[PDB]
Amino acid sequence: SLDYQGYLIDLDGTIYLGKEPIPAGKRFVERLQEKDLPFLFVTNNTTKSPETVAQRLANEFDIHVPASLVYTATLATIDYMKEANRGKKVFVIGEAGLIDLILEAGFEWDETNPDYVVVGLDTELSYEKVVLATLAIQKGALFIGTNPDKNIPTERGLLPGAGSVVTFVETATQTKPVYIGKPKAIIMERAIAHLGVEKEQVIMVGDNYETDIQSGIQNGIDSLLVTSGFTPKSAVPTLPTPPTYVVDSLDEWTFEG
Amino acid sequence: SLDYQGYLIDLDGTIYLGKEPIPAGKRFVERLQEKDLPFLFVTNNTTKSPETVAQRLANEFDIHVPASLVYTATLATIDYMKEANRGKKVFVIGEAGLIDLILEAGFEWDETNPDYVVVGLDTELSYEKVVLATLAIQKGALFIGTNPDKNIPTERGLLPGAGSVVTFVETATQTKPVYIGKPKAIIMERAIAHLGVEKEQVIMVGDNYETDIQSGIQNGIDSLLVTSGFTPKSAVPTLPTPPTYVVDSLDEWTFEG
Numbered sequence A, B: 001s002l003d004y005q006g007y008l009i010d011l012d013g014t015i016y017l018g019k020e021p022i023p024a025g026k027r028f029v030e031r032l033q034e035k036d037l038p039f040l041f042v043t044n045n046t047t048k049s050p051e052t053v054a055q056r057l058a059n060e061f062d063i064h065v066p067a068s069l070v071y072t073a074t075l076a077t078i079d080y081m082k083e084a085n086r087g088k089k090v091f092v093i094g095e096a097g098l099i100d101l102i103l104e105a106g107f108e109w110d111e112t113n114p115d116y117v118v119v120g121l122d123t124e125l126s127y128e129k130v131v132l133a134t135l136a137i138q139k140g141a142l143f144i145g146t147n148p149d150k151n152i153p154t155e156r157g158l159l160p161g162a163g164s165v166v167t168f169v170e171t172a173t174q175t176k177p178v179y180i181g182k183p184k185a186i187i188m189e190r191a192i193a194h195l196g197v198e199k200e201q202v203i204m205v206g207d208n209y210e211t212d213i214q215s216g217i218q219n220g221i222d223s224l225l226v227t228s229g230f231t232p233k234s235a236v237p238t239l240p241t242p243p244t245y246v247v248d249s250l251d252e253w254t255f256e257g
Helices: A023-034 A050-060 A073-084 A096-104 A127-138 A162-173 A185-195 A209-219 B023-034 B050-061 B073-084 B096-104 B127-138 B162-173 B185-195 B209-218
Strands: A006-009 A039-043 A070-072 A089-093 A116-119 A142-145 A151-154 A157-160 A202-206 A222-226 A245-247 B006-009 B039-043 B070-072 B089-093 B116-119 B142-145 B151-153 B158-160 B202-206 B222-226 B245-247
Touching: A006 A023, A006 A185, A039 A185, A050 A070, A070 A073, A070 A185, A073 A096, A073 A116, A073 A142, A073 A185, A089 A096, A089 A127, A116 A127, A116 A162, A127 A162, A142 A162, A151 A162, A185 A209, A185 B185, A202 A209, A209 A222, B006 B185, B039 B185, B050 B070, B070 B073, B070 B185, B073 B096, B073 B116, B073 B142, B073 B185, B089 B096, B089 B127, B116 B127, B116 B162, B127 B162, B142 B162, B151 B162, B185 B209, B202 B209, B209 B222
Parallel strands: A006 A039, A006 A202, A039 A070, A089 A116, A116 A142, A202 A222, A222 A245, B006 B039, B006 B202, B039 B070, B089 B116, B116 B142, B202 B222, B222 B245
Antiparallel strands: A151 A157, B151 B158
16 A cells, blocks of 8 residues: 555444444444554544443444544543643543543542533533533633534434533633544544554544544644535535545545555 | 753743843843753744744844744744645735745745635735635635734734734635644644654743743643733733743743742
């Protein structure tokens, strides 16, 4: 080959659409595995840990990968917190797979004067929670947003996503948050860190234009769009900026070009 | 200097204010050179080449440094353009300095259908100019904003800055731009590369909280604030989040932590 030596891949909308799998998507992983190519999964979904994902992967879609190949926004979040080093105390709004991981990273749950206030998706959000966070932020805590996604795909349709919840807090505190997830650099920098190869020979693969393809454009990384998820192959034209490559199915992508 | 091994410093408002030099600023550099501590100047100012700056710095402020130690948003901009690797055609809005270096690189001036549309602050901005960019961006051109700062300080006061002009184009095209300068990652990822010392042992130094201090917290890099430029010592108390350190003169800072 001698083109792209490492691959960053989105999950939902790319490898599996809800509970229904993506044939091509699954063949895409096998070829990468078979050809011994380096690749990393990147998702802004913080509700599930790596282990929990690799399982759902090797249990509902027959894809077999170690949990280390699943790089989530939660990972880049603990990574940024450590790197920012503003103390151990933290307050969080999110599902367990976000709170558990963080606290397991060395931080301490603090609802009054935490050093950090991390906000992610929480389907059990309550007025009280954002009240805690608003007070915490007002006292100085650093406001962190897990990912800017305004919505999130479910069996009921497009529900409110991490992004929408973050904005709720942002509005109540008139404070811009530090976003971690795609298309922000933070998660991407860390991703390339794990992948193991440098940007010039790496390429972001995904179905969504707002998060996946932007991850590439925002950070100097080639992108490959697959019209199998969100953005239809109809919207390919009109897109503010074209992705490095456009394919209607990963089966049309050859690791030689 | 066990603590910080690499320094990133702002220029205007830190080393000098207009045509008047900041004594403490100069001594600051002298001590950094006497201790062999590596450092790198990083400014969002694009009106002059690193060479021009260094010359002025040496023959007008008695601060001797090779031009290679002056990293500009411009440099960061051309780096991004090449990294993005789209066409070579470009359309730009700004002062000669910005336009010249971009053209002096390997780009070609194209007002009709350029591959990139770079927008910076242009004091001779005209309606026609934003028209050309609007159209070009409508055709697919990647929209690039030099730096987000909304205003700019001058003899006359707080005038509209790069950020404002960018926003003007943004509204006409309803397209978000990719920002290059402080506090954005792009310029900082590049800044750290030239500095050579690893991120956790580097500290950003500056007078402006929103541009400099923020470039620090936004990218997981320690901050050092000097209440000498923009941000006064009175505002320090109400800041959204404090810089890693606050000082009222670079003199007060020693290289032992």
